[PDB]
């Protein structure tokens, strides 16, 4: 599994390479149910190892 996001290496479990920002993004922002940024598809596909 490659965490290379435009040269920056994301955290192997807590981060993913977000297409919108082209930066490493915290998995908690898309995997948490209470937050307004919850995205089930992104959490399932980009943050499999999270939690």
């Amino acid at each position: 599994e490659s965490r290379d996001c435009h040269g920056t290496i994301c955290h192997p479990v807590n981060e993913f390479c977000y297409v919108a920002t082209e930066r490493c993004h915290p998995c908690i922002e898309v995997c948490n149910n209470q937050t307004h940024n919850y995205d089930a598809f992104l959490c399932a596909k980009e943050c499999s190892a999270y939690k």
Partner: protein, 141 residues
Amino acid sequence: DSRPAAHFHLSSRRRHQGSMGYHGDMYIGNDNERNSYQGHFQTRDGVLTVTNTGLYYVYAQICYNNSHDQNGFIVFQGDTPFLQCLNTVPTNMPHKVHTCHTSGLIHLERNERIHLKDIHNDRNAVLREGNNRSYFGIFKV
């Protein structure tokens, strides 16, 4: 009488799997009632095919109405992302409505194709008949 120009009202979306990991939803556009482009364009499944090679100006707009901080879409030239629009609207406020508009010149050869795809999946956007908030169009220069 037919002219290589058209305005499309974005009326629905379809799940779509792309060439290079672009798995965002494909936007589907309905013809404006005064469109007439027989022999210049062909449209199937949200993909517009150009009949003759030429230089075309394209504009695209999606009006988002969801809670997410980041939203955006891509105009594809073939299977290459060519034009893009992105908005950041922060805070957990429920009443987020914003249009994302972009445009540009795209040189299209004969039988080359363009299509419109969101960056995300299952993001609420304004999609309806005669849409006056999300639309996209093209004309030869």
